[PDB]
Design a protein around this ligand. Structure first.
Ligand SMILES: Cc1cc2nc3c(=O)[nH]c(=O)nc-3n(C[C@H](O)[C@H](O)[C@H](O)COP(=O)(O)O)c2cc1C
Ligand SMILES: Cc1cc2nc3c(=O)[nH]c(=O)nc-3n(C[C@H](O)[C@H](O)[C@H](O)COP(=O)(O)O)c2cc1C
Ligand SMILES: COc1cc2ccccc2cc1CCc1c(C(=O)O)[nH]c(=O)[nH]c1=O
Ligand SMILES: COc1cc2ccccc2cc1CCc1c(C(=O)O)[nH]c(=O)[nH]c1=O
Lengths: 313, 313
């Protein structure tokens, strides 16, 4: 029985990795993720310039998940490019670098400089589309004309295989339209479903107060709240993008949740909220739990069940 | 100490009611909801003609909530109108009738006929804008030009105060656009936030199967999964629609959950999944629980805290 995968011309010991933004902002964080049993890691979504992000408190967690409005705090692109080019040990596991420029031009500028490092070291790009653009316009992946622009410009500037991080969708017509845009771009080799469920609001009954400071307490939701939404999006894109990989993200706390993701279509399975809460020890537990479900079922490899979710009649 | 309130020129014993679709399809269901301790009831969303709805299984519930693709099974409009006009005992509690025609014309035809019964009997209209859609087009409330058309046409045809059932939104620019549409219509006097979170996917690990038959297992989510989504939409519309009421719906299992809806801005509080699961006894428990939290806090009225959620700095 094994959890090994080979994809994107890399080899992975197992399908687990952090979700972008968790345990990946500093060199310390990246070294920690590298030392963990995860099969890969991804760096914090970066901007050209370093950012301090939003005022605190800007993350809170609870039994059923988390809420955040971090504001893209990050050490800036040059830091993450240096990590990728000079510090990361590729003998340990593969590295994804996430970018989240505030404009299409900022993304182009970063990808242009990432490309020779990607070619030489094999760092993999995850472009974050679940990201602000013009204020008063929907996030990029909810504005399909902007999404197409961003992918055209990045495809031209980068010229190498990459993947994209998507927000959740809730309407079949959106699945249809979004997948059809992605399927215009052959360099888009993987699609990560999903980023947080946008602008939720957690309220504490005792204090009568929101629990995060930015945006009057509105922020993105992660965790147990979002698992069925994550599954739906993994499977919707798995079905509509047959020449691309889907990576699953949302609501993973156990090997069983990972099994469901993989049944839906996931290749890699990313862990955000639960990793934030439990720490990097989670990865040994998830591996063990997933192997136990595979053993009970007679499954020897991930491909035996990936995308094999059954429907009824 | 009592939870009685007045809204929309009606008096309500308490803010609780069923959510449309739950315990409200047949005459038996309606009589059960009338006999309960709820403050009001709403009928099943109806179409001009009766519908069987989707193949079973089409509803399933779990510890964290429910998934459904009912397909608008209903007895048809003539039945609900007859219930409103001849069968409902208005001395017991107010009645809302939910309409969900599959086109604008179908809605106009129903509301023209409802108008006189509304005038004579005081039945209240909830127009369901969350109703579902054709390949190549999003649901009405996610297509702001269609929404504006529906509301123009219904307002002209009905000519009396009414409300709208909204799907959740996830993007602040969408809150701003949707609320601005609603605010164009002075006869829209209440906004019910939210309908189910669309197109989630629940998978059973043991069976490796989706749990509902229609739509390859995709359906609307209710229950604990959606409470922070529901509170965000309640508060977003409460803030943007100062001349309207907001009715909260989503994730209510306890008086504490109802308290958070009211803090967010809710005037009435609708109960879907929890009611389906617990039955109509839930209403006495919710009342008791809500009055207990009020008592502990020193609140004597709902208006003392409605919409008074605190933000940080
Ligand atoms: C604290 C925090 C920071 C995050 N930052 C990013 C980020 O920089 N880029 C990104 O693509 N997603 C980011 N996310 C979203 C996660 O990558 C993930 O998509 C989301 O939390 C859902 O997974 P979960 O249910 O395992 O938390 C962040 C989430 C959290 C909680
Ligand atoms: C079985 C079922 C049927 C429903 N039918 C309708 C309906 O006919 N019209 C409607 O506006 N919403 C309908 N909904 C949505 C509920 O009114 C409610 O918006 C949603 O379930 C979220 O509330 P909850 O978290 O309390 O379940 C239905 C929900 C369920 C579970
Ligand atoms: C839509 O995700 C974001 C929201 C932001 C809100 C205010 C300011 C900046 C924001 C930046 C992003 C993109 C980064 C990101 C963040 C974040 O750094 O806040 N949190 C997530 O849950 N997912 C993300 O992709
Ligand atoms: C989300 O609302 C619907 C989804 C449907 C999916 C397939 C076929 C018909 C559908 C009709 C509706 C509108 C009625 C409705 C239903 C329903 O009857 O399935 N369930 C809900 O959670 N909310 C509703 O508002």
């Amino acid at each position: 029985m094994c959890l090994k995968l080979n994809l994107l011309d890399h080899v992975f010991a197992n399908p687990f990795m952090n979700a972008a933004g968790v345990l990946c902002s500093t060199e310390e964080d990246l070294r920690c993720m590298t030392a963990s049993s995860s099969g890969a890691l991804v760096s914090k979504s970066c901007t050209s310039a370093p950012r301090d992000g939003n005022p605190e408190p800007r993350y809170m967690a609870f039994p059923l998940g988390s809420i955040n409005s971090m504001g893209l705090p990050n050490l800036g692109f040059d830091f993450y490019l240096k990590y990728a080019s000079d510090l990361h040990d590729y003998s340990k596991k593969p590295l994804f670098l996430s970018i989240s420029g505030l404009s299409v031009e900022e993304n182009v500028a970063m990808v242009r400089r990432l490309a020779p490092v990607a070619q030489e070291k094999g760092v993999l790009l995850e472009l974050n589309l679940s990201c602000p653009n013009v204020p008063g316009k929907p996030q990029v992946a909810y504005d399909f004309e902007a999404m197409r622009t961003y992918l055209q410009q990045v495809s031209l500037a980068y010229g190498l295989p990459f993947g994209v991080k998507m927000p959740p969708y809730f309407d079949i017509a959106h699945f249809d339209t979004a997948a059809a845009v992605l399927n215009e771009f052959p360099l888009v080799k993987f699609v990560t479903c999903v980023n947080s469920v946008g602008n939720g609001l957690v309220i504490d009954a005792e204090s009568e107060s929101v629990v995060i400071k930015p945006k009057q307490g509105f922020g993105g939701l992660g965790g147990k709240y979002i698992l069925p939404t994550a599954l739906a999006n993994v499977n919707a894109f798995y079905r509509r993008c047959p020449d691309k990989l889907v990576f699953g993200c949302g609501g993973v706390y156990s090997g069983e949740d990972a099994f469901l993701h993989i049944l839906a279509g996931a290749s890699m399975v990313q862990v955000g909220t639960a990793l934030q809460e439990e720490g990097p020890g989670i990865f040994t537990r998830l591996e063990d739990e997933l192997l136990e479900i595979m053993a009970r079922k007679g499954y020897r490899t991930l491909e035996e069940f990936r995308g094999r979710v059954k429907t009824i009649e």
